[PDB]
Structures are given as structure tokens and as C-alpha cells.
Amino acid sequence: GKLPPGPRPLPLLGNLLQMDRRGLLKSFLRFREKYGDVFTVHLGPRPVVMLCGVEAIREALVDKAEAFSGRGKIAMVDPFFRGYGVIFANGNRWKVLRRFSVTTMRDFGMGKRSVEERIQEEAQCLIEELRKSKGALMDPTFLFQSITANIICSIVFGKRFHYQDQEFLKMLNLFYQTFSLISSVFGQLFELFSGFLKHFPGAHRQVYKNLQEINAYIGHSVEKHRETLDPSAPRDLIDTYLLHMEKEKSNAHSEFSHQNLNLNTLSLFFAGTETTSTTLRYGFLLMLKYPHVAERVYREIEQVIGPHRPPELHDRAKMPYTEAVIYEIQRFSDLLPMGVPHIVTQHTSFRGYIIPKDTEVFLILSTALHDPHYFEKPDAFNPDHFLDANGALKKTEAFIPFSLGKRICLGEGIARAELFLFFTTILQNFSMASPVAPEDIDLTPQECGVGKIPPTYQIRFLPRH
Ligand code: HEM
Ligand SMILES: OC[C@H]1O[C@H](O[C@H]2[C@H](O)[C@@H](O)[C@H](OCCCCCC3CCCCC3)O[C@@H]2CO)[C@H](O)[C@@H](O)[C@@H]1O
Ligand SMILES: OC[C@H]1O[C@H](O[C@H]2[C@H](O)[C@@H](O)[C@H](OCCCCCC3CCCCC3)O[C@@H]2CO)[C@H](O)[C@@H](O)[C@@H]1O
Ligand SMILES: C=C1CC[C@@]2(C(C)C)C[C@@H]12
Fold this sequence. Notes:
The PDB classes it as oxidoreductase. The protein is of the alpha+beta class. It contains 16 helices and eleven strands. The chain has helices spanning about 25-35, 55-65, 65-70, 80, 90-105, 115-135, 140-155, 165-185, 185-195, 205-225, 235-245, 260-290, 290-305, 320-335, 365-370, 410-430; strands at about 40-45, 45-50, 70, 340-345, 350, 355, 360-365, 430-435, 445-450, 450-455, 460-465. The strands form four sheets. Strands 1-2-7-4-3 form a five-stranded mixed β-sheet, with helices on both faces. It has a two-stranded antiparallel sheet with strand order 5-6. Strands 8-11 form a two-stranded antiparallel sheet. Helix 6 runs antiparallel to helix 7 (about 140-155) and helix 8 (about 165-185) packs antiparallel against helix 10 (about 205-225). The longest helix has about 30 residues, at about 260-290. The radius of gyration is 22 Å and the shape is globular. It binds protoporphyrin IX containing FE (HEM), 5-cyclohexyl-1-pentyl-beta-D-maltoside (2 copies) and Sabinene (SNE). Sabinene binds near residues 77, 182, 270 and 271.
């Protein structure tokens, strides 16, 4: 009958005075030193249980899924989402939204394109755009958000936007700034003291205002889908939801509400755009720092695919090196180092500790991805972390960047397809250069909070021959 151990808190400040200035993640890795894999930290007024290492995390999300499957809050965006949409929902609202989103993120209608096909098409558009740049320097952030946003758009809104569309780019800008502001030092501090800091000016207000501006776009798209809805031929995920709404309207407790429609839709957009693109940004920075890996990846593309046939998912199994590189990009880039917060949904016992219902829990995914027993020298980028003796692909159970269990990333199959196809399709057509010599490329993230965000950089894409 005790919570996990941890540093002794003060009233009001919780463990603030024991924290590391460099962030939550660093704070928690120090605590782990002292207390081991399961400990309690008081983030202002809330005790939060931290679980570290693949064994503890898997034991919680998979073996104790009846208790560890709740969703906790991200203080920076809770005032906006308020438990609407699939990411932030619990209970029956979650079950409904998850079932809906999973099915509709995969089955689209006979004669509608596959996931692979939309990605393949977006990849050709991206290569045509990169050709048109003629080797000019760019920060590729906007293009990497455009291609990942466009895959979600084709599912959600039934169309794609053009790369030079300044309105499309305005919404990409809002998603980008929001993810940065959520992961900033302020955003981390807000996680501790949201109750106090919310009365004052700060980034939380800018985040809230950004999300309302994206929400206004969605609300208008929804209305215009409603006006043109053909109940016999759903175009996209919005039409499918409208039909469920119509079908359940006689139940006042239907979860197909207007607020879930907007916020689930937003949720999918945010997650679909900022995750994969951020991974891509890091991956191309790593290719600049390790041009020998990129050159090896090209050799493999040449031998297995050739210089012109578009890459397809069937190529994956014949490309162990490219796959190792992409896993290692994900491992090293550690997109969500503390995952997304969980909450326990019933009184539970965990390695002797007793964790009461409603206790918030962070799974520190970063500790699995940097576990030195699975990855020798885990702080260095090295695709050999994923290769055996023969150069064959060695997967491992510590590779959990999508989490595990009931709340495991529902975009996983999409993200993996997007990483492989965009990565290989770009390298099939271009090598990369930049004004910064490999030795001087600094990989230090620009933010490290909920999200790990790479520094900005310039790069050129040089066409092959
Ligand atoms: C590199 C790409 C991605 C990574 C590393 C990633 C990682 C994650 C993680 C760690 C979670 C939290 C799981 C948990 O709560 O324990 C999550 C949830 C989620 N992700 Fe992904 N994600 C990626 C791409 C995507 C994409 C492309 C989509 C959209 C198609 C997406 C949609 C979602 C949704 C809707 C949830 C909430 C699931 C739920 O709470 O039921 N993610 N993701
Ligand atoms: O109808 C009234 C409203 O219209 C103007 O806002 C527009 C701007 O006129 C207009 O340029 C705009 O075009 C956006 C198209 C790009 C959509 C990109 C999507 C990417 C995926 C996630 C959703 C957004 O959409 C916004 C919402 O319609 C205004 O911003 C708001 O005043 C006002 O509330
Ligand atoms: O005592 C009653 C109150 O307590 C619950 O919430 C509190 C928590 O009790 C209480 O801890 C809180 O104060 C926290 C002080 C945090 C110190 C400020 C830090 C901010 C920047 C970094 C250094 C200092 O403010 C919140 C709002 O008052 C409630 O939010 C309010 O109902 C209620 O007014
Ligand atoms: C992919 C995700 C899951 C939760 C999240 C928030 C900022 C939308 C970090 C984005």
C-alpha cells in the first residue's frame, strides 16, 4: 500500500526544486539513477508515475492493459481538446472514436486509392517539386509537412493541396508553431503549474488561439461537406462521420457529436502531419551528418529498385539496410520521449506498489529506445543498431517509438509507409548537400519537451546525373 518511491516534494512546488533546468526528460533520467525504473514525481500538485525501460512499459501497457490504458492530459492543449477527439478521449467516447478512426484510416471505398498509392503519388509530386528547385538551398520543413499533411488530407477531405498554396501553408505554419510551443521550456513548466500560469499571458494562449484557427477551417469544411453530401457515395472520412451522425441522431448520448467531428478531425491532422515530418526533418539532417550512410542507402536502391521504377512497399523486405537506417532515424530522433500521458483507470498493483485510480503515468519511451543492453552506444546514430552479423535486419522488442497496447499509435502503418516511400523515393532521385561540413553539423534538438524537435537547417537536393 504505497506509491512508487521518489524525490521528497514540497507543498505547492511538488518536486520543482529537485528538477533539472534542461527539461522534464533530463529531470526524470536523473530520478531514474537514484530510484530505478518505477518512481513518482510531483509535477506541481500532481503525483505522476514514471515507468522506464521496455520491460516495465510492456508490463504496464500490454500485461496490465485493463488498468494502464487511460489517457492523461497535456496541459498545453487540454484547454482546447478537453477530452474530445480520439487522442484525448477516454471511456466510451474513446472506444467509439478509435473504432471509427481505425476503420476509416484504412477502408476508403471500392475504386478509391490505397494508402500506398496515395503516398506513391505524393512522392512523385514531391520529386517534381524538388527538380524545380534546381539544387537551391531550402529549409525543407514546409515540404516535409506538406507531403505528410497531403496523405491525411486525401483521406479526410478527399483532396490534396498544392505546395505553393499560401493558405495551405498558413495551416502548416500553425501546426509547426504549436508543436514547438508545446515542447518549449514554457510548455514544460506549464505542465507543472498550469493552474497558476493560466491567469497570465504566455504560450498557452498562443497555442489555444492557433488550434482555434485550424478548427475554424475544419468547421467550414465540415459545413460544405454537409451541403454536398450524397448518402449513397461518401467521398471521404468527413462524409462517413456525417452519416454516422445522421444514423445515431435519435440518441442524445451519441458520441458522433459536432465537437468530436471537429476535434477528432483536427487530432488526425495534427498527429498525421507533425510526427512523420519531424522524423523526416531529423532523418535528412542525419543524412547530411553521415553522407556515407546516405550513399550506402543509394547503392541499395540502385541494386534493388533501379534508378527509375518508383519504390513500393514490396521492396522493403529486399532492403534491409534502408530499413535499418529508417529504424535508426526513428530510434535516434526519439519523437515523443515521454510518449503521450496515460492515466490508470482502476486501482492497480505494480511491482509491489499500489497505484490509485486516476493516477497519471508517463511511459518514458526514450529509455527503451536508448537502452544500452539493446543498443550499444545508444546516444550515437548508427544503423548497425538494427543489423545482424550478415547485414540482415535485426528488429528488437526495445524499438517502441509508437508505444504499445490499447493506445498504440493508430497511424503506425501509415507513418511506416510514409517514411520508407518518401525516404527511398527522394534518395532514388537526389543526393544531398549543405553549406555545413559533416563534422560541424550539430544534432542538438531545438526543443525537447513532449516533442523532440530538430534544429532548422538548409539543404540542397542535387539530381542524380
Ligand atoms: C513517426 C511517426 C509517428 C510516431 C513516432 C508516433 C507516435 C505515437 C505515440 C508514441 C503515441 C502515443 C501512444 C500512447 O498513448 O501510449 C501516438 C498516438 C497516436 N497517433 Fe501516432 N505517431 C506517428 C505518426 C502518426 C500518424 C501518421 C498518425 C495519423 C495517421 C498518428 C495518429 C495518432 C493518433 C490518432 C494517436 C492517439 C491514439 C489513441 O490515443 O488511441 N500518428 N503516436
Ligand atoms: O468564414 C469565415 C472565416 O473565413 C476566413 O478564414 C479562412 C481563409 O479565408 C482562407 O484562406 C482559408 O483557406 C485555407 C485552406 C487550406 C486548408 C489547409 C488544411 C490542412 C489540414 C488541416 C486543416 C487545414 O481557410 C480559412 C477558413 O475558411 C478566416 O480566417 C476566419 O475569419 C473566418 O472565421
Ligand atoms: O487553494 C484553493 C485553490 O487550489 C486548486 O489549484 C491551485 C493549487 O492549489 C495551487 O498549488 C496553485 O499555486 C501554485 C503556485 C505555483 C508557484 C508558481 C510557480 C510558477 C513559475 C515557476 C516558479 C513558481 O494555484 C492553483 C490555483 O489556485 C485550484 O486551481 C483553485 O481552485 C483554488 O482556488
Ligand atoms: C502525435 C501526437 C500525439 C499527441 C500529440 C499532440 C501534440 C497532438 C503529440 C501529437
